[PDB]
Amino acid sequence: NLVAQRFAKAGQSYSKHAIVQKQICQNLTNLLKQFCPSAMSRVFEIGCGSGNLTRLLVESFQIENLVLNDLYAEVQQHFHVKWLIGDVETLEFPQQLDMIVSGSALQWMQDLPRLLQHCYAALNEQGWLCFSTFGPKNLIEIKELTGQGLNYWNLENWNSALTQAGFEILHLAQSETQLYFDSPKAVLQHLKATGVHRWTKQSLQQFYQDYDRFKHTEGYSLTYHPIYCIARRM
Amino acid sequence: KNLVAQRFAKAGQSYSKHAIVQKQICQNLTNLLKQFCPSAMSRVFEIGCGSGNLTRLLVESFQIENLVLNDLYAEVQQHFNHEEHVKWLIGDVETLEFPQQLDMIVSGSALQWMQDLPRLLQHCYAALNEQGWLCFSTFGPKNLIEIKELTGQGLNYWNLENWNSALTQAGFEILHLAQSETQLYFDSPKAVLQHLKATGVQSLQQFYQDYDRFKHTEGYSLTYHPIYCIARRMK
Ligand SMILES: Nc1ncnc2c1ncn2[C@@H]1O[C@H](C[C@@H](N)CC[C@H](N)C(=O)O)[C@@H](O)[C@H]1O
Numbered sequence: 177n178l179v180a181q182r183f184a185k186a187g188q189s190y191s192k193h194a195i196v197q198k199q200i201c202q203n204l205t206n207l208l209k210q211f212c213p214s215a216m217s218r219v220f221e222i223g224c225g226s227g228n229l230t231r232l233l234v235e236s237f238q239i240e241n242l243v244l245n246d247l248y249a250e251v252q253q254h255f256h257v258k259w260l261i262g263d264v265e266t267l268e269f270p271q272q273l274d275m276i277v278s279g280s281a282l283q284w285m286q287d288l289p290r291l292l293q294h295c296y297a298a299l300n301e302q303g304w305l306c307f308s309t310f311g312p313k314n315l316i317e318i319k320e321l322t323g324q325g326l327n328y329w330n331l332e333n334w335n336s337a338l339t340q341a342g343f344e345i346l347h348l349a350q351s352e353t354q355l356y357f358d359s360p361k362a363v364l365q366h367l368k369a370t371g372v373h374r375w376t377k378q379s380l381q382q383f384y385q386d387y388d389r390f391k392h393t394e395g396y397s398l399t400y401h402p403i404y405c406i407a408r409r410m
Numbered sequence: 411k412n413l414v415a416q417r418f419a420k421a422g423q424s425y426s427k428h429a430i431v432q433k434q435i436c437q438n439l440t441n442l443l444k445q446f447c448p449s450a451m452s453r454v455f456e457i458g459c460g461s462g463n464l465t466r467l468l469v470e471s472f473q474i475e476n477l478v479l480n481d482l483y484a485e486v487q488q489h490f491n492h493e494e495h496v497k498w499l500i501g502d503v504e505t506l507e508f509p510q511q512l513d514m515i516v517s518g519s520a521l522q523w524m525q526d527l528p529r530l531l532q533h534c535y536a537a538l539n540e541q542g543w544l545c546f547s548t549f550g551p552k553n554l555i556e557i558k559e560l561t562g563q564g565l566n567y568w569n570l571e572n573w574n575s576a577l578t579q580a581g582f583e584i585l586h587l588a589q590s591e592t593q594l595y596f597d598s599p600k601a602v603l604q605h606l607k608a609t610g611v612q613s614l615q616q617f618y619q620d621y622d623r624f625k626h627t628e629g630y631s632l633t634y635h636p637i638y639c640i641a642r643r644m645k
């Protein structure tokens with residue numbers, strides 16, 4: 177017996193900053209372990225990259241066939257497992273899937289409704305669509321000070337698009353985490369390290385000075401805004 | 411410099427097997443243990459082990475040389491068979507001398523019953539090794555608030571800031587301290603009482619009628635308010 181729920185969570189943490197991406201993959205995997213059976217036959221992963229999610233997925237789930245996708249063949253350097261390299265928005269999906277899973281990749285998509293339609297057509301009845309992406313305040317400090325950043329869907333955008341694509345929402349949540357760095361230069365070092373070129377001295381100095389607007393008692397904020405979703409073909 | 415403080419807020423919608431609420435809390439705490447704690451911890455003291463919902467997860471994911479299990483009631487021992495590396499410390503944890511030289515003190519869904527948490531945290535500090543771990547789940551003030559309002563029965567719970575201040579006072583650094591307020595939405599008030607009996611927690615018609623004050627769009631609310639903590643003895 178499943179019951180609907182709504183929740184609010186809040187707290188503080190004191191953790192490594194270089195592992196944010198893997199931590200998001202761990203949080204998505206922890207959700208998979210709830211909603212999904214331990215055994216699955218056919219899984220398709222969109223945008224596997226280095227495999228931060230892939231490692232956790234095979235460790236927690238018994239898969240018989242795993243299809244991995246990413247834009248570039250260079251990711252296979254980091255690696256019953258098939259590969260489909262290319263733009264997922266034009267690739268032929270593997271068909272008759274038990275689950276489509278994707279961590280931190282859908283924010284790069286040009287036409288999300290059309291991609292969701294292809295996800296719906298490729299999944300079995302009651303097939304799983306499970307993903308993490310990011311919401312409108314992801315890296316908001318960087319967008320405010322540099323003018324660069326993606327335009328992100330909010331939670332209601334996703335709720336609407338998933339419903340029109342024919343999916344049942346089992347979990348849909350937004351999390352907002354402020355990391356507090358000791359100095360503005362530590363923020364840029366973090367972004368350079370985690371993979372998110374030299375700037376001019378003037379741009380750098382203006383950036384450091386403008387970052388005073390994000391100073392807290394704990395430090396200078398950098399915001400991550402992941403969205404987590406467990407959905408089902410209805 | 412590799413560690414940064416952070417603050418977070420999460421919100422969303424979900425579905426849960428309502429019967430698994432206490433097991434889910436144990437799993438959530440165990441996930442935090444796995445994130446923060448080393449895989450091997452020689453000496454571990456569990457407070458309020460009960461039937462072992464947290465104990466089984468702890469032994470599964472951590473290499474423990476001496477596991478000291480406490481509960482108020484000896485009856486909990488019936489839920490364990492041929493448990494390995496265990497020392498039993500049956501009794502009121504608020505009166506018992508703690509085991510010495512601990513690598514971790516851990517507790518799931520038991521601290522809400524404590525009559526004197528500040529003194530307990532002092533005993534935790536004294537029993538732990540240098541930078542030893544104190545890791546627990548408990549509940550906050552909105553836990554089962556609908557049942558407290560309608561029946562008058564319920565505990566007084568510490569809030570998150572109470573814990574923050576008490577841990578720092580007792581000599582612990584806080585690696586993780588968080589709360590989740592979750593409203594479960596049942597189809598009818600009858601289903602709320604069935605859930606409560608299954609999980610182990612004129613008047614009946616008045617209870618059903620009184621539950622109208624908790625009617626939402628999704629159904630009739632029952633709130634759980636778990637609190638999770640990863641802490642370490644300050645060097
Ligand atoms: N249109 C696209 N088709 C396929 N892969 C894409 C597309 N756009 C971006 N990607 C990949 O999406 C990945 C996104 C990265 N944030 C890595 C995600 C990876 N799952 C992880 O969490 O480690 C990169 O490997 C991109 O190359």
Ligand SMILES: Nc1ncnc2c1ncn2[C@@H]1O[C@H](C[C@@H](N)CC[C@H](N)C(=O)O)[C@@H](O)[C@H]1O
Binds near residue numbers: 457459464517
């Ligand atoms: N003063 C006390 N000293 C020791 N154990 C206690 C005390 N008060 C309550 N308990 C135990 O705390 C436990 C709380 C229960 N919610 C079970 C928790 C258990 N860790 C579980 O996850 O199943 C019960 O077994 C109680 O008997």
